[PDB]
Design a protein around this motif. Sequence first.
Motif, PDB file in Angstrom:
ATOM      1  N   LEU A  70      30.951  33.403-106.398  1.00  0.00           N
ATOM      2  CA  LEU A  70      31.360  34.552-107.196  1.00  0.00           C
ATOM      3  C   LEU A  70      30.829  35.871-106.664  1.00  0.00           C
ATOM      4  N   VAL A  71      29.663  35.833-106.019  1.00  0.00           N
ATOM      5  CA  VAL A  71      29.078  37.009-105.350  1.00  0.00           C
ATOM      6  C   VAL A  71      28.981  36.874-103.832  1.00  0.00           C
ATOM      7  N   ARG A  81      42.547  35.038-105.542  1.00  0.00           N
ATOM      8  CA  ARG A  81      42.840  34.123-106.654  1.00  0.00           C
ATOM      9  C   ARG A  81      44.034  33.222-106.335  1.00  0.00           C
ATOM     10  N   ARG A  82      44.304  32.344-107.266  1.00  0.00           N
ATOM     11  CA  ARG A  82      45.394  31.426-107.171  1.00  0.00           C
ATOM     12  C   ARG A  82      46.705  32.188-107.271  1.00  0.00           C
ATOM     13  N   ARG A 332      38.783  30.936-108.450  1.00  0.00           N
ATOM     14  CA  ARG A 332      38.764  31.511-107.075  1.00  0.00           C
ATOM     15  C   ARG A 332      39.192  30.474-106.069  1.00  0.00           C
ATOM     16  N   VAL A 333      39.875  30.928-105.028  1.00  0.00           N
ATOM     17  CA  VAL A 333      40.531  30.031-104.104  1.00  0.00           C
ATOM     18  C   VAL A 333      39.625  29.898-102.920  1.00  0.00           C
ATOM     19  N   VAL A 350      41.029  24.947-105.529  1.00  0.00           N
ATOM     20  CA  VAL A 350      40.704  25.959-106.509  1.00  0.00           C
ATOM     21  C   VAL A 350      39.351  25.692-107.100  1.00  0.00           C
ATOM     22  N   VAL A 351      38.429  26.599-106.817  1.00  0.00           N
ATOM     23  CA  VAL A 351      37.136  26.599-107.483  1.00  0.00           C
ATOM     24  C   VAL A 351      37.215  27.443-108.767  1.00  0.00           C
ATOM     25  N   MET A 352      37.035  26.747-109.882  1.00  0.00           N
ATOM     26  CA  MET A 352      37.175  27.264-111.229  1.00  0.00           C
ATOM     27  C   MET A 352      35.813  27.417-111.934  1.00  0.00           C
ATOM     28  N   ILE A 353      35.709  28.250-112.973  1.00  0.00           N
ATOM     29  CA  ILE A 353      34.429  28.491-113.615  1.00  0.00           C
ATOM     30  C   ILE A 353      34.591  28.608-115.111  1.00  0.00           C
TER      31      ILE A 353
END
Length: 455
Positions: A70-71, A81-82, A332-333, A350-353
């Motif tokens: 994320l940072v 993004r997707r 985030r992709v 896809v990394v999701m949070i």
Amino acid sequence: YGTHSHGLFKKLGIPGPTPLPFLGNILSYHKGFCMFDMECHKKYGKVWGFYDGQQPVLAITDPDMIKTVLVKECYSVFTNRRPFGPVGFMKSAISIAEDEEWKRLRSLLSPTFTSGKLKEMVPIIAQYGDVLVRNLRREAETGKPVTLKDVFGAYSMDVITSTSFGVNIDSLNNPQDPFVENTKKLLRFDFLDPFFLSITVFPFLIPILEVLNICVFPREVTNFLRKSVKRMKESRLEDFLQLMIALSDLELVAQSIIFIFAGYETTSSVLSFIMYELATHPDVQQKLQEEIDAVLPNKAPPTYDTVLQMEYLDMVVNETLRLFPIAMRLERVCKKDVEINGMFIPKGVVVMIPSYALHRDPKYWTEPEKFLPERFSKKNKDNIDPYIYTPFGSGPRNCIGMRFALMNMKLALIRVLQNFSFKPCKETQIPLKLSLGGLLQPEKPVVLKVESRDG
Ligand code: HEM
Ligand SMILES: CC(C)(C(=O)c1cccnc1)c1cccnc1
């Protein structure tokens, strides 16, 4: 075949729910997004994996990894993004821009959001604090329950016109056919309605639609706005719009559309949640209503700075968002193959949070279903983890209009509270509700009785 990636979260070792041939896991979405994200939290622990059709999606949780995606690697790996439905020219809007196009557009429109240009803007917004109250007379003065998003929609609309373009109208009922009418139609997308649900299972369908000029932003509306900013660059020669005066000309129309898109409906939806939490909590309302009168000598116009110092207000805000993080995930992709604290992630994933989950994970919060601001006073304020309370995201691709959103919301509460009080009644259905759509939203619209504070 329809099961391309379905054997990625066995072979790589990540656990998770087990996909059907073409659908993957979408049938879990009858709960809506949140509930599936929770249930999987409990279930597959701290990291897990699933397939939106055949798009493999990896959830995360440990803040250390959260931060690294994320940072940290954020430019290196993890920047876009997707992709979603057919987007056409809105391809160049900043939320949908990717990679270097995004980097360009970001640091360019950053200047536009600097506090300064914001405190420069507050007088404009204040103006629609009064207008909002005047027309909330004739909801109370008519002693009938009050549908809040109807009153806060017009406030958003009113503030959205002025800040974005200059046009200064009282859409707030009254002149409700100018221009209100296109903006009225720019509604957030429900990624669980049958259209996008189709497109997720049928990604190949998107380029098709591209060609037929079918576009997910209503062309009626984009056309209109595209010609309205036409009309204006001209007229003015003799505000976000002017503010933006390389940045492309017809790129400016994409941003200012996106500024309306994000701003309009979220602002009115959150706002009316807050006023849900100050009914059956007149005890919080009091601390606030009083807090206000003290900073604003019995009725006084809020100022930019009168705002920032009202940190029981700031507390009710944060906790309201805690419960209702309108973007129930940040997502985030993964650019390419990469490892993140010993967990490894392949390209195209896809990394999701799970923000709304995280925001109720009994691990960083306690009695986490409760509305109780005192989490956000100093002594509680700064123990809780920044990558857990993420209602505007974190890192370079966070809400570029965060401060603005927050400014504008508070600004509205003050003038409202400092004149009124909000209590339950008929239809004010006290449990809470919550749609099983893909928008985080009531289900039944919040309606209240609104009793005037001497007036
Ligand atoms: C109700 C308050 C709002 C919330 C909770 C909110 C939430 C968010 C979130 C979660 C993101 C993604 C963050 C991330 O990826 O880490 C986002 C992005 C964005 N928001 Fe907001 N937003 C709000 C109000 C606004 C308003 C008023 C604007 C008006 C300009 C706005 C404009 C944007 C834009 C342009 C992006 C994407 C920027 C980029 O991706 O680089 N938001 N918003
Ligand atoms: C749609 C948009 C622009 C956005 O970028 C967004 C919203 C939720 C999750 N991720 C991104 C948005 C939506 C609402 C508020 N701000 C921004």
